[PDB]
């Protein structure tokens, strides 16, 4: 890694001053996301000067007060140099992204990742109103294989889960629906048992279980749904084999084991309202999409991509690809740094020159 | 006569009188507290009325034992088996002394 915050966090520094510097870098990353290396160097240089200042016979309180005065003057100077920026100017955003990506390993790929990062930030916010950017709305997917040139910006939803259906891997004009209940044998929250006292009761149990599953699947199908996402379930089988067979017989793609924490992201992405009981499962709960297919990454895995939605509400997904683990991790970190730079530009509409110019002018 | 140490009085014991001038003593080997009727006993009901009847029946069993002891005329009750807090408070209400877990000797 080239990230200063990551470098400081990874190595286990023991001196308390080093730990405080690590916390400083983490705070700078939280507030800004870029300059995590510069701030630590600035603090180190300040303390190095403080050594000579203390050796001369100056109390630390006077040094701190003078440093506060210098900080105020420096903030004034930095504000004076800067110039206003407009979010409608794509060139300035691209230049900021390229400058953020110059120091990272993905510098020859900047021509691809700078517009990608700018578009990703601009697609999740309202340029005329937003005063901050929620970077949790930009999902990053790391898949091995290929090169960093294969990074692609998905306007829809990318799921790492695999389709449980066999032979159904591409749906057009999909009607996606989230399910938060289980398609299996009925099981109340109370302690429940079925008592059999006659021989006919066994085949009655089998027939009624089959009828219940078939009725559930028929209710799901009658709404026009053709792609089903099933939330991950514990203590109850989310997807029974009989239910899977019935869904396959009706030509419905099924994806199970959906993570609980990803429900909100999916709902914001494809405009699907989750359903917890089959009684309320109706057509309005579904989220229309142009295409829902599972793609193969040239033998490096499979991804389920849902591109094209009637309500693409402020959410994008970024797929990062590369040769080995280290390069894809560093590409992810660099892309996050670029997104943080654009976020800072959104928060404070002010741009300043780089290449050490602010530091030289501030020193003078 | 006989004298022995106090044996782990329950709540409400200090409300009982600690002196009698002609008491009748009920020497018992009985567990006087709410508990399962038997270790292997199982209760199977399918109505809330039966549920309430069952809880009232348990309370009535305990209170019937205590009522029999009370109308026995005794003022001091001693037992090998533990005497519960409910029985202790019941005996305190009637101004009697109770002591459970008394040693056999």
């Amino acid at each position: 890694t080239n990230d200063g915050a990551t470098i400081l966090k990874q190595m286990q520094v023991l001196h308390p001053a080093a730990r405080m510097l690590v916390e400083l870098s983490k705070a700078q990353d939280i507030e800004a996301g870029d300059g995590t290396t510069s701030v630590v160097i600035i603090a180190g240089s300040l303390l190095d000067s403080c050594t000579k200042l203390l050796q001369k016979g100056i109390h630390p309180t006077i040094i701190s007060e003078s440093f506060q005065k210098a900080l105020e003057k420096g903030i004034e100077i930095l504000t004076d140099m800067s110039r206003p920026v407009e979010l409608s100017d794509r060139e300035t955003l691209l230049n900021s992204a390229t400058t953020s990506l110059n120091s990272k390993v993905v510098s020859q790929y900047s021509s691809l990742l700078s517009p990608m990062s700018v578009n990703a930030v601009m697609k999740v916010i309202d340029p005329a109103t937003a005063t901050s950017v929620d970077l949790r709305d930009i999902k990053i997917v790391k898949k091995l294989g290929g090169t960093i040139d294969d990074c692609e910006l998905v306007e829809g939803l990318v799921l790492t889960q695999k389709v449980s259906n066999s032979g159904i891997t591409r749906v057009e004009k999909a009607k996606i629906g989230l399910i938060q209940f289980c398609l299996s044998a009925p099981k109340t929250d109370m302690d429940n048992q079925i008592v059999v006292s006659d021989y006919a009761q066994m085949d009655r149990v089998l027939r009624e279980e089959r009828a219940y599953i078939l009725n559930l699947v028929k209710q799901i199908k009658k709404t026009g749904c053709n792609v089903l996402l099933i939330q991950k379930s514990i203590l109850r089988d989310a997807l029974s084999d009989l239910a899977l067979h019935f869904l396959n017989k009706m030509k419905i793609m099924v994806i199970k084991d959906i993570e609980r924490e990803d429900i909100e992201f999916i709902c914001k992405t494809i405009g699907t309202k989750p359903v917890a009981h089959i009684d309320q499962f109706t057509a309005d709960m579904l989220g229309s999409a142009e295409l829902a297919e599972e793609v193969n990454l040239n033998g490096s895995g499979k991804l389920l991509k849902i591109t094209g939605c009637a309500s693409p509400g402020k959410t994008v997904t970024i797929v990062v690809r590369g040769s080995n683990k280290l390069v894809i991790e560093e590409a992810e970190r660099s892309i996050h740094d670029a997104l943080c730079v654009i976020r800072c530009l959104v928060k404070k509409r002010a741009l300043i020159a780089g290449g050490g110019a602010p530091e030289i002018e501030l020193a003078l | 006569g006989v004298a022995f140490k106090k044996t782990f009085s329950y709540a409400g014991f200090e409300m009982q009188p600690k002196k009698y001038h002609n008491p009748k003593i009920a020497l018992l080997n009985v567990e006087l507290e709410l508990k399962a009727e038997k270790d292997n006993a199982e209760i199977r009901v399918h109505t809330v009325e039966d549920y309430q009847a069952i809880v009232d029946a348990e309370w009535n069993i305990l209170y019937d034992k205590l009522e029999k002891i009370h109308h026995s005329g005794a003022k001091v009750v001693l037992s090998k088996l533990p005497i519960g807090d409910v029985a202790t408070q019941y005996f305190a209400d009637r101004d009697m002394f109770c002591a459970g877990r008394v040693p056999e000797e």
């Binding site: 400083l24 983490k26 701190s64 209940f181 059999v196 309202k273 989750p274 | -």
Partner: protein, 526 residues
């Protein structure tokens, strides 16, 4: 013959004991070490400390609080344990004065060591110290000034007390802003002593001056999926119900049927019960719903379809704070909507603080619950700011409870010591010497105050003593320039309760330790 210094051995393996001189030496060494450690962090110019844990966690903590320093140290000397417990109890009773009480106890025990070296029976020292404590307490009470009747004067006193409390801590850089913050937070409590109603949120990043007191309330929980993210003129209903596979309390109940159709029917019955509960909740006519426990997917979907916010897993503190700030009642049954009060606020919306999203309650109805956002550069800075705000809030709440105030900057110590010296000048015997040593320790307190600042402590203390003997009862140390001046004019005031507690606790601990002449140690487990 001594217990241990006898031909026969009377102890287990590892058991030890120390007789009069050895016990006194050990106790005095421990007390002096504790006092010297806690001091130099005292006064406006005091410095902070670094606490490194020897455990696997290796937690790093930078603090100026005396109680915090004394808590996180492994002390073997029992007298050190006595001083640590005294400081902890002082912190529990009032937010400030831990360093002051520890230093006063250490100085008193040093004077006691000197007196013992002068061949004075410890009982005489104890009697003299009791007389001196009585005189000093009476003088301090006589010097107390109350401004509770006035409003603007009481507000100014609160300002001065908060500033004096925050002067020593790291917040002295933005003392004015933080003092205003703390006094506003305390005044928002409407006279209640509940300091749990004031919530401190530490968010990394940003400047220390970026810290602020929210005009409403902030919650760090999440909203449901389909529920709205912004509601105006919200009607709040705070609850502590199940909302999560709510099972009937009859634990002996079970479902026993002969078919799966009956099981499905019972499932539908359970879902209908949950739907009926949600309908009963909605019948109150609400826009927002805060539940202490979890809310599963079915009630969450019902609330979303009803267009009602459902904040889940707001812990006991959270629901109590929401009830205090909005006026709602924490209800667990919904069969009587007319008997349940509903909270209100102008607006509820999500806010972007740092990189984390929080729920903002704006235009609250009551507002007797505060949230404070702390922005800092390091975790240690945030923790120290939180501790400093805790000290300031505690002292301000104590002042609100008891409005009597006394002047700080060593003025109270000078006045008490002058009273003690006046008492000692009319008393014959060695009790006079003991009381003079008491007054000497009281003088040593602002001497340490001045030493921490690098000023000439001897000359300043002599000037203060002369001024207090002449009749200038409000003379005190002026740390701005290193001179002495009027504390009433400079606005350096302190809570009378804090000073009285410091004096009494220090005297009590010194008396307790001085009575010891033998330390017997049992064999440790290790």
């Amino acid at each position: 013959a001594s217990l241990s210094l006898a031909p026969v051995n009377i102890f287990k393996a590892g058991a030890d004991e120390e007789r009069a001189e050895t016990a006194r030496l050990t106790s005095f060494i421990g007390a002096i070490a504790i006092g010297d450690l806690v001091k130099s962090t005292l006064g406006p110019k005091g410095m902070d400390k670094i606490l490194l844990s020897s455990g696997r966690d290796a937690s790093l903590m930078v603090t100026n609080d005396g109680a915090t320093i004394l808590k996180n140290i492994g002390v073997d000397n029992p007298a050190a344990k006595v001083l640590v417990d005294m400081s902890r109890v002082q912190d529990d009773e009032v937010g400030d004065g831990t360093t002051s009480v520890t230093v006063l106890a250490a100085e008193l025990l040093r004077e006691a060591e000197s007196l013992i070296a002068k061949k004075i029976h410890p009982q005489t020292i104890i009697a003299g110290w009791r007389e001196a404590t009585k005189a000093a307490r009476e003088a301090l009470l006589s010097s107390a000034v109350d401004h509770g009747s006035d409003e603007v004067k009481f507000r100014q006193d609160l300002m001065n007390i908060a500033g004096t409390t925050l002067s020593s801590k790291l917040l002295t850089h933005h003392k004015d802003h933080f003092t205003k913050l703390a006094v506003e937070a305390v005044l928002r409590l409407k006279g209640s002593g509940n300091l749990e109603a004031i919530h401190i949120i530490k968010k990394l990043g940003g400047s220390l001056a970026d810290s602020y007191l929210d005009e409403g309330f902030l919650l760090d929980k999440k909203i449901g999926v389909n529920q709205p993210k912004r509601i105006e003129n919200a009607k709040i209903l705070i609850a502590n119900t199940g909302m999560d596979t709510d099972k009937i309390k009859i634990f002996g109940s079970r479902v026993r049927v002969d078919s799966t159709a009956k099981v499905a029917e019972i499932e539908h019955a359970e879902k209908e019960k949950m739907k009926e509960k949600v309908e009963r909740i909605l019948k109150h006519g609400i826009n927002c719903f805060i539940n202490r426990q979890l809310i599963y997917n079915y009630p969450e979907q019902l609330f979303g379809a009803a267009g009602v916010m459902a904040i889940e897993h707001a812990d006991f503190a959270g629901v109590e704070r929401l009830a205090l700030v909005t006026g709602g009642e924490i209800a667990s049954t919904f069969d009587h909507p007319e008997l349940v009060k509903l909270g209100s606020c102008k607006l509820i919306e999500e806010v972007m603080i740092g990189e984390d999203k929080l729920i903002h309650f704006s235009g609250v109805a009551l507002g007797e619950a505060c949230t404070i956002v702390l922005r800092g550069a390091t975790q240690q800075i945030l923790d120290e700011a939180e501790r400093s705000l805790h000290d300031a809030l505690c002292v301000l709440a104590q002042t609100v409870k008891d409005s009597r105030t006394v002047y700080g900057g060593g003025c109270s110590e000078m006045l008490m010591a002058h009273a003690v010296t006046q008492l000692a000048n009319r008393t014959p015997g060695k009790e006079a010497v003991a009381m003079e040593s008491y007054a000497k320790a009281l003088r040593m307190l602002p001497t340490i105050i001045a030493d921490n600042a690098g000023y000439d402590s001897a000359d300043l203390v002599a000037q203060l003593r002369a001024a207090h003997s002449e009749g200038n009862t409000t003379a005190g140390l002026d740390m701005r320039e290193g001179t002495i001046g009027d504390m009433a004019i400079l606005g350096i005031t302190e809570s009378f309760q804090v000073k009285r507690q410091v004096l009494l606790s220090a005297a009590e601990a010194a008396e307790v330790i001085l009575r010891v002449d033998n330390i017997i140690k049992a064999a440790p487990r290790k």
